[PDB]
Amino acid sequence: QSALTQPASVSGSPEQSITISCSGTSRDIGGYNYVAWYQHHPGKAPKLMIYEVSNRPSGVSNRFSGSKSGNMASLTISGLQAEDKADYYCTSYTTGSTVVFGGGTKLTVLGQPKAAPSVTLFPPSSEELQANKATLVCLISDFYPGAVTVAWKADSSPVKAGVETTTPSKQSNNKYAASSYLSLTPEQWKSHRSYSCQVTHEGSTVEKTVAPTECS
Amino acid sequence: QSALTQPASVSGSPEQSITISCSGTSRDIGGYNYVAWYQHHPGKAPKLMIYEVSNRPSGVSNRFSGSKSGNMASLTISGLQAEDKADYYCTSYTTGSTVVFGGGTKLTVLGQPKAAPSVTLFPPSSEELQANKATLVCLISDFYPGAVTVAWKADSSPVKAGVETTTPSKQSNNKYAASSYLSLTPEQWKSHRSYSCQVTHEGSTVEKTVAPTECS
Amino acid sequence: QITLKESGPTLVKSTQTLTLTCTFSGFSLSTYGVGVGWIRQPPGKALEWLALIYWDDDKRYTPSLKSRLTITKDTSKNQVVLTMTNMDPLDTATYYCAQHTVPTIFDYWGQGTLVTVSSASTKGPSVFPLAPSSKSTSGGTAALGCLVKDYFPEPVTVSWNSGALTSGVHTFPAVLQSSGLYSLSSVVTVPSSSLGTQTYICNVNHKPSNTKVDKRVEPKSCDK
Amino acid sequence: QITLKESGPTLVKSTQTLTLTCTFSGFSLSTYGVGVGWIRQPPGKALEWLALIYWDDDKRYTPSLKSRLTITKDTSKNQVVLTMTNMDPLDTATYYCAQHTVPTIFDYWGQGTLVTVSSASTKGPSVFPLAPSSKSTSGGTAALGCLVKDYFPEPVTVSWNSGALTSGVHTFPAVLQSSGLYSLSSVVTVPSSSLGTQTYICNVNHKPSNTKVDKRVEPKSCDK
Amino acid sequence: ASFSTFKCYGVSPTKLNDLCFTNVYADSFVIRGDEVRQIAPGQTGKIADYNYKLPDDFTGCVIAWNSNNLDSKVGGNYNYLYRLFRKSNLKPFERDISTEIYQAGSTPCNGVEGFNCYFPLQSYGFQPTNGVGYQPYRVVVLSFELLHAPATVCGPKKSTNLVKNKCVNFNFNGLTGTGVLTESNKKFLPFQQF
Amino acid sequence: ASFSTFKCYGVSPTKLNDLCFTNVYADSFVIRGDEVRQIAPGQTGKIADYNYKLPDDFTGCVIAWNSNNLDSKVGGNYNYLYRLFRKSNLKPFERDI
């Protein structure tokens, strides 16, 4: 591992306290100092929060704190406010002469009530097949908070080629939505026995399935 | 782990300076001052270039310098002459009764403007199944410099056994081509769903994949 | 001047034993702090130390092959003999004998010698065609290849259409499959407008068995 | 208050040489422990550090791009110049300069600059339908889609039935294709029984190319 | 709470707060952690023999601290160099800045580097992730100097009132004793003290 | 051959087998090797000044032996502490918590 670890997102009740967890190896984190956390208001330039392990920052609030785990790190942010809504990052100095970031992080304040996601799946169209193409479309909408995980399955086995996903955004009705596609040739779609799209959010998981035999 | 590590390749314009890294572990270079660097032209024998961590045997041009700061050695060469196209092995002792060598580094000075490979894939032919054998061919053409890495996946999961490759071969085009072969039997090839070959060159990555259902 | 030289059989029968007799001149092995050692490089892989014998008839080997090797000196002959048992194709490589003295680990190396482990006699090749599964040639050309497999020993002469075409022709050296045979393939580039319309024949001969063979190569559709 | 900004054109040509200026005020760069560095960020991915220069002119670079990066400086000008060679479409990203002093890595960033590598010229849109599979729905309503593609540069205007309908009209953000041309989609929500019974059309307008396209959108059953 | 090493030769740090001295020199340099021990009188080592030497009768103090945050760079620092080869061990408090090539064998350098003919200075290469054994340390050595002259280095202690006609213990500008102090007609040399 | 340093002050180890004493106080602790020299009468240093001070009239032995294989951890052992500051210097054979 040369890139540190971070989770998909995070959120809690207002005025709460909660820890963002960052992970790696003793080769770069825990066994070495100089770990750093970062905050990122979307559209704006990130600002430093923790610089070595758990030090109070240069010029901002002390609700944040670090951890000195032998391999882990924890940014314990307390007192969630509407301002705090933003992304997060974990960075450190590599064993070699290079600096690496993390995998990113999202943080929201659970402003609106938690909502399960509506998921739909659409199979290839006749015109698409006529164009020597077959794209299965998975659509997600009407959910919150806006952090999702998506995956595709074929014959009860993982499928990784031809899968594409897009970032969630805000809809007019103040919910969030997302889209994903699975591209295959007409023969691959027709030949197999089933396909499925799975969505995970708030711990809940939903799945939708199609098959050429059903489309027959 | 009982071996060092080296970069796949490096380059630079003539009369330039470039460094080659050599990373070990705690028990390979635990502050030991017994790193050695050998140049290696194909055909001719290796010629010791650095012998303690920086000392130069009589005869070798003073260009080479060598250096070491942590669990990592570094051969620093100033003034890349056109005649230094070769390999650069790094070696040392070990806490155990052993001398170990690195992975080899392919410096490159005499160069043509960088060009990515062109990759093709070919599946096990039907006649081979008639001969109860199966093979996947991953061919690469027209790339510079002569440095490439090849990996294979089955069911979109990494595989290691039954894979063979070849040295980047110079060709009349003045650029390097290579190939790789993955051996299987018809039963394993048919039972599994997909097979993918991925080529890494100059950081960039290319990939291709085939499946038995393509026979139809 | 100081110069080493390796010698030994260029081929071996698998599971038999391999003996190398490295020789040297310009230095006396009886000197203090001077011992001769072996390093073998499997083709296209990293190096691998093998064994090492010091001035005072003191021998040492890498752990992973301790039970395998055995080294012997003779200052009277000025020769170092390295004997290893039960060879194998995985152990095919180019061997180097080199003088050694800390800290100049392996200061002077010899030219080295290739050595291979095969358990089969001459065998004709199996030849396969290789063409795209479709006419998709957005790059303006199509690559068509010939595969040669399960043949021994080298070399093999390859040609396309009675040698008419030589531009855009790429060939690879033989590769030693663990089975102990050799395989390779070559590719020619043809215009994307010549797919199927223009005939293409690939011919190959394996002189040890004078197996003059040919095969037509053509892409095949997926309408099946 | 440490002020930092950038300058230079946002549009770039592939294979040309990129040139950017970064301006600063409120401090001098000759001071010890103070440098200026660069970092770029493609959409959706993590940032990508490029290079940096210390007060003492001891320039430094990341290994992966050393052949390409170049940085020029002068304190009297109060700005720095960053240049790159052999632009590639994948370089399309947002750049940012900053002040560097370990361990507060890039304590103060600038506003950055959007940069795109593309040799494509002005082009109009192409419209296709994205209707569902069948002339039926589950929850009494369903979406009819319209896809715009191959339009350059952004943006492009869309509508339905020449503005005669507003039932659940949506238009998602566009995506830049690999070729450098854009693509987006629009949707209109209608009841299930409406399919094959009420006319629905999608209209697209592109002022830069002065192009206008229309496309009737009604599902065609795939049962055939 | 920032000094890793604080040693004293010829004087105790605890009582140093109330001593008077003629002069004190401060010698500042940057060395790696393991080289702190080399900074001492009678010690042997590369730094002790080629860079810094202290006399056997040295009287002073040595202070060291970690200076990575200010004297390191991401890609390594080569602006700090130390001598590695010396013709002869330096005399105490001797500074050498000669760049002349050094001969480690029989071949004469003749002012040009070569086989066994190398530059006498070697860089350090400080990196942020560099190990503690090689992490840069800023080191200051305070050498004290006392003479048969009035002492100009004084402590911060506040003077006391002149208890005159009583038995006291007194300290005037470092001259200490016990007695009773009274005025007199004694007309003194108008330039020096006692 | 199991002890790196065996230094006797005020008595010779060789003759110690032929001597009698009222009582023996065996003190035990762990420090880094570089600071081992600080455990000796008439020595000035943080360890001796604030943690373990031996008297000028000391008469005994000091035995220091490496314990890397027994007091080290991959992630870093921190079970061993030591005082770093104090109001005043520590008197001989004194302990504070």
Side-chain angles (χ1 to χ4, degrees):
Chain A
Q1 175 178 14
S2 196
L4 281 292
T5 320
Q6 291 193 289
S9 197
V10 76
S11 285
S13 77
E15 294 189 46
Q16 194 174 330
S17 302
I18 164 174
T19 86
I20 318 184
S21 53
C22 169
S23 322
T25 78
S26 58
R27 189 212 67 260
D28 268 10
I29 165 168
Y32 252 75
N33 236 347
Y34 264 58
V35 164
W37 289 86
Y38 257 81
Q39 184 165 272
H40 180 162
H41 170 215
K44 304 314 306 169
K47 182 197 299 302
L48 175 47
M49 296 292 156
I50 312 299
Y51 62 79
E52 205 174 327
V53 181
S54 45
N55 312 67
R56 205 165 286 185
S58 63
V60 285
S61 77
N62 68 351
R63 265 157 286 209
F64 310 68
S65 52
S67 175
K68 328 191 283 288
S69 152
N71 265 317
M72 313 282 86
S74 159
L75 155 54
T76 292
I77 194 181
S78 49
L80 286 302
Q81 316 315 337
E83 176 23 73
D84 313 354
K85 307 181 293 264
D87 290 9
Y88 278 74
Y89 295 99
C90 191
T91 184
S92 160
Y93 273 116
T94 59
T95 189
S97 185
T98 306
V99 48
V100 289
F101 306 105
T105 279
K106 279 199 52 47
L107 171 135
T108 54
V109 291
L110 279 142
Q112 318 73 320
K114 55 155 284 185
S118 317
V119 178
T120 307
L121 183 51
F122 302 100
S125 96
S126 285
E127 176 93 348
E128 203 170 44
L129 294 158
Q130 287 152 13
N132 200 26
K133 292 176 184 174
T135 313
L136 286 73
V137 174
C138 198
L139 183 62
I140 320 105
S141 58
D142 325 300
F143 85 109
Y144 163 105
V148 303
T149 316
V150 60
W152 288 79
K153 292 193 295 182
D155 307 337
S156 311
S157 296
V159 77
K160 310 190 173 184
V163 182
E164 292 196 12
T165 300
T166 54
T167 172
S169 210
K170 183 215 142 277
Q171 336 318 120
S172 266
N173 34 25
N174 307 312
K175 325 306 184 316
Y176 274 58
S179 311
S180 190
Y181 303 150
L182 168 54
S183 303
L184 322 156
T185 59
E187 282 63 31
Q188 303 164 250
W189 146 247
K190 294 178 172 183
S191 34
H192 292 357
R193 300 183 280 104
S194 70
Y195 279 89
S196 307
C197 167
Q198 99 195 24
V199 185
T200 297
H201 166 251
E202 165 265 2
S204 312
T205 304
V206 186
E207 281 193 359
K208 298 295 179 184
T209 300
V210 289
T213 52
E214 303 154 22
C215 296
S216 73
Chain B
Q1 176 164 356
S2 197
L4 316 204
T5 297
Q6 266 208 276
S9 70
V10 307
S11 171
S13 73
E15 277 281 46
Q16 199 31 285
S17 305
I18 274 300
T19 81
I20 304 171
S21 56
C22 179
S23 100
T25 170
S26 62
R27 61 194 183 172
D28 295 19
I29 311 180
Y32 314 150
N33 273 256
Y34 285 128
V35 152
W37 297 76
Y38 306 92
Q39 171 166 321
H40 181 185
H41 273 123
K44 286 146 65 188
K47 180 193 284 287
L48 169 55
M49 290 261 157
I50 315 295
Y51 85 72
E52 259 156 3
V53 65
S54 51
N55 296 65
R56 299 174 282 207
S58 164
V60 74
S61 301
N62 53 339
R63 264 171 290 290
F64 310 88
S65 36
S67 164
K68 218 196 98 167
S69 54
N71 203 241
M72 148 87 59
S74 324
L75 167 53
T76 303
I77 171 170
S78 64
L80 286 166
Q81 327 310 70
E83 60 278 36
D84 310 82
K85 183 33 171 53
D87 290 12
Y88 278 82
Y89 297 81
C90 155
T91 186
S92 148
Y93 291 109
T94 298
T95 186
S97 87
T98 300
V99 48
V100 289
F101 286 103
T105 287
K106 238 144 170 163
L107 154 80
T108 325
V109 50
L110 190 60
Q112 91 83 0
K114 200 192 301 296
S118 40
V119 175
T120 62
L121 228 41
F122 297 87
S125 73
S126 74
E127 55 272 41
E128 211 196 336
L129 330 170
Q130 283 174 180
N132 82 306
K133 312 206 153 185
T135 47
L136 278 152
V137 157
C138 195
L139 212 178
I140 330 181
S141 73
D142 203 317
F143 54 81
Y144 166 100
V148 168
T149 291
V150 200
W152 289 81
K153 294 214 289 193
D155 304 323
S156 312
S157 305
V159 286
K160 299 179 176 178
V163 176
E164 300 178 356
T165 167
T166 312
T167 318
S169 159
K170 162 80 173 69
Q171 273 302 9
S172 182
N173 51 344
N174 315 84
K175 236 186 285 175
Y176 286 92
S179 58
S180 99
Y181 293 78
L182 153 58
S183 265
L184 308 160
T185 63
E187 311 325 328
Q188 328 147 325
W189 152 246
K190 276 302 227 168
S191 53
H192 288 278
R193 304 273 63 70
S194 62
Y195 280 88
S196 314
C197 170
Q198 329 63 28
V199 162
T200 314
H201 165 87
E202 284 283 297
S204 69
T205 305
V206 181
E207 179 170 53
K208 292 295 163 219
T209 292
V210 285
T213 49
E214 296 171 302
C215 295
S216 304
Chain C
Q1 83 307 1
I2 180 169
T3 36
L4 271 50
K5 266 179 63 56
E6 284 72 347
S7 182
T10 47
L11 83 86
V12 317
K13 296 265 198 177
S14 34
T15 66
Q16 304 315 97
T17 172
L18 159 47
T19 284
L20 281 315
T21 300
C22 158
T23 174
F24 39 83
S25 80
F27 81 93
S28 170
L29 180 55
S30 181
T31 311
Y32 201 71
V34 202
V36 159
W38 292 90
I39 312 95
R40 78 179 181 203
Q41 166 165 40
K45 277 81 67 164
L47 270 283
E48 167 188 71
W49 174 51
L50 195 45
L52 166 144
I53 165 176
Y54 274 128
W55 66 92
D56 49 304
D57 180 7
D58 201 357
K59 312 143 185 77
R60 302 191 128 59
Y61 324 101
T62 185
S64 81
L65 293 321
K66 184 181 292 322
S67 175
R68 184 70 71 58
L69 325 165
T70 279
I71 192 154
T72 293
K73 57 166 291 206
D74 194 292
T75 309
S76 71
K77 317 331 181 299
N78 325 66
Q79 279 187 352
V80 178
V81 152
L82 166 45
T83 166
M84 74 206 319
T85 60
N86 63 282
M87 286 280 72
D88 163 283
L90 168 59
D91 230 6
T92 279
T94 167
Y95 282 31
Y96 291 135
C97 85
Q99 156 171 116
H100 155 288
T101 174
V102 199
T104 62
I105 318 189
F106 305 123
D107 186 330
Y108 292 91
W109 304 44
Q111 283 214 330
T113 87
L114 289 82
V115 174
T116 176
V117 197
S118 197
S119 204
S121 168
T122 180
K123 341 179 89 190
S126 301
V127 282
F128 306 76
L130 315 162
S133 56
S134 71
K135 286 187 182 177
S136 188
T137 51
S138 62
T141 59
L144 300 176
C146 329
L147 153 63
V148 185
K149 211 196 172 280
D150 315 329
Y151 97 84
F152 181 100
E154 326 197 342
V156 300
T157 292
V158 190
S159 42
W160 325 66
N161 323 298
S162 78
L165 317 180
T166 56
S167 179
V169 172
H170 304 294
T171 310
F172 300 109
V175 190
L176 185 72
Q177 305 132 79
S178 167
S179 63
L181 288 48
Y182 282 143
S183 310
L184 46 69
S185 190
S186 190
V187 154
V188 72
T189 306
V190 305
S192 168
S193 313
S194 85
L195 319 172
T197 71
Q198 175 42 41
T199 314
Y200 290 102
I201 193 76
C202 174
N203 44 27
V204 178
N205 193 9
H206 151 249
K207 303 308 304 304
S209 70
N210 57 67
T211 317
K212 289 176 180 186
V213 295
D214 73 6
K215 184 40 58 199
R216 184 211 41 51
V217 190
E218 276 186 17
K220 304 177 177 180
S221 177
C222 287
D223 289 310
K224 302 177 280 182
Chain D
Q1 148 48 251
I2 193 76
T3 305
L4 175 59
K5 214 53 191 163
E6 266 158 23
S7 183
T10 172
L11 164 157
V12 201
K13 294 169 76 70
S14 305
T15 73
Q16 249 285 14
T17 177
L18 170 149
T19 299
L20 296 165
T21 305
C22 174
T23 87
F24 64 72
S25 45
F27 80 134
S28 173
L29 190 53
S30 170
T31 300
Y32 183 99
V34 176
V36 291
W38 277 109
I39 182 147
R40 95 183 191 227
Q41 161 64 336
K45 331 330 311 172
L47 294 104
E48 212 153 83
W49 153 48
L50 306 194
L52 61 83
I53 177 165
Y54 294 118
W55 61 97
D56 53 351
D57 184 348
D58 182 352
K59 297 167 181 182
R60 281 221 68 261
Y61 304 112
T62 184
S64 300
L65 281 68
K66 179 190 279 264
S67 181
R68 184 181 301 71
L69 327 163
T70 312
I71 167 164
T72 43
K73 31 144 289 177
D74 170 289
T75 314
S76 88
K77 313 191 172 286
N78 319 45
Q79 312 97 350
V80 191
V81 173
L82 177 81
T83 64
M84 318 270 293
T85 281
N86 199 27
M87 333 321 310
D88 153 26
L90 257 200
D91 285 328
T92 298
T94 55
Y95 280 54
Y96 293 88
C97 42
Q99 171 193 272
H100 182 27
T101 89
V102 64
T104 175
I105 302 114
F106 297 108
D107 167 29
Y108 272 99
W109 272 299
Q111 184 59 285
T113 40
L114 160 46
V115 182
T116 201
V117 175
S118 205
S119 299
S121 55
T122 67
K123 185 184 173 308
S126 315
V127 152
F128 333 102
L130 292 178
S133 60
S134 63
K135 318 242 206 171
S136 183
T137 86
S138 50
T141 61
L144 295 161
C146 183
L147 160 63
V148 192
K149 197 180 153 278
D150 303 70
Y151 66 96
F152 164 101
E154 270 271 316
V156 66
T157 298
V158 74
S159 64
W160 283 83
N161 205 308
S162 302
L165 259 167
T166 326
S167 176
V169 166
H170 332 118
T171 308
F172 278 42
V175 76
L176 177 60
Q177 301 288 7
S178 57
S179 64
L181 306 171
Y182 296 96
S183 325
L184 63 73
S185 63
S186 189
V187 159
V188 68
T189 309
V190 312
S192 321
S193 62
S194 90
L195 301 175
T197 68
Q198 172 53 48
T199 299
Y200 299 111
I201 299 161
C202 156
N203 213 353
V204 176
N205 193 10
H206 193 245
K207 291 178 184 179
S209 66
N210 314 307
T211 309
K212 296 184 175 180
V213 188
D214 317 69
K215 184 68 65 169
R216 206 166 305 98
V217 182
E218 270 155 61
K220 286 180 181 182
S221 203
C222 297
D223 163 55
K224 300 180 185 179
Chain E
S2 48
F3 300 112
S4 59
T5 293
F6 182 17
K7 206 178 295 203
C8 313
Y9 291 75
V11 75
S12 97
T14 61
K15 303 193 258 166
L16 251 181
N17 87 81
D18 57 5
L19 259 53
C20 208
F21 282 93
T22 317
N23 299 302
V24 305
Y25 299 171
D27 318 56
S28 157
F29 51 67
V30 179
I31 49 163
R32 38 184 289 277
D34 269 10
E35 290 171 339
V36 182
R37 63 146 276 275
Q38 283 195 52
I39 309 305
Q43 277 296 307
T44 48
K46 274 178 261 190
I47 306 301
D49 303 354
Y50 305 159
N51 289 270
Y52 204 52
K53 174 66 157 178
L54 298 166
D56 291 329
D57 62 348
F58 164 73
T59 308
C61 314
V62 172
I63 284 157
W65 80 78
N66 305 24
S67 188
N68 50 38
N69 275 246
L70 290 79
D71 302 311
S72 168
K73 293 169 294 211
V74 175
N77 190 3
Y78 302 140
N79 205 346
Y80 289 110
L81 323 170
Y82 75 105
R83 195 169 295 274
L84 175 57
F85 292 119
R86 199 75 199 84
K87 262 201 181 78
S88 69
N89 302 356
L90 282 167
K91 282 127 198 157
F93 298 130
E94 190 189 12
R95 198 189 316 163
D96 190 339
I97 68 189
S98 171
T99 50
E100 183 153 287
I101 310 306
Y102 158 83
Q103 176 171 341
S106 43
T107 314
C109 322
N110 292 328
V112 180
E113 88 304 4
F115 178 78
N116 289 133
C117 299
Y118 301 139
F119 208 65
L121 312 183
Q122 180 98 323
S123 317
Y124 264 109
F126 294 122
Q127 322 193 301
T129 46
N130 190 346
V132 302
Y134 315 97
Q135 273 211 59
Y137 279 16
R138 276 178 180 199
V139 163
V140 163
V141 167
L142 301 191
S143 49
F144 289 62
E145 316 187 341
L146 254 171
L147 291 167
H148 192 3
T152 59
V153 173
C154 326
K157 48 171 55 176
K158 175 63 210 63
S159 295
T160 326
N161 300 70
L162 285 178
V163 179
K164 201 136 54 163
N165 190 8
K166 297 177 58 47
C167 175
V168 317
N169 64 63
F170 63 121
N171 184 358
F172 291 96
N173 278 358
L175 170 55
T176 50
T178 36
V180 78
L181 320 175
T182 83
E183 310 88 356
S184 59
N185 63 358
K186 285 201 170 88
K187 184 33 52 193
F188 258 38
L189 74 183
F191 67 72
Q192 273 297 331
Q193 222 70 7
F194 68 102
Chain F
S2 47
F3 302 111
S4 72
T5 295
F6 201 128
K7 200 156 285 216
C8 311
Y9 304 70
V11 47
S12 148
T14 61
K15 315 285 275 183
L16 247 200
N17 232 359
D18 214 338
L19 279 166
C20 271
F21 311 94
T22 314
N23 291 300
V24 182
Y25 299 56
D27 257 13
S28 50
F29 42 86
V30 168
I31 44 158
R32 78 187 258 189
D34 282 354
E35 297 165 337
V36 162
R37 59 145 276 279
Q38 281 199 53
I39 309 301
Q43 286 300 310
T44 45
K46 274 181 239 198
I47 302 302
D49 292 350
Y50 303 137
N51 312 89
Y52 191 46
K53 180 68 156 176
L54 293 175
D56 289 333
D57 204 349
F58 174 110
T59 64
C61 299
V62 176
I63 302 161
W65 50 315
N66 194 320
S67 73
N68 191 39
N69 278 335
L70 302 166
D71 292 303
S72 297
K73 294 189 73 158
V74 183
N77 191 349
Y78 298 98
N79 292 356
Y80 293 111
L81 318 178
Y82 82 107
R83 194 175 295 279
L84 184 52
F85 310 115
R86 210 169 176 281
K87 271 192 157 68
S88 69
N89 182 282
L90 190 73
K91 268 144 190 67
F93 285 126
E94 182 184 5
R95 197 162 52 234
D96 52 9
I97 48 169

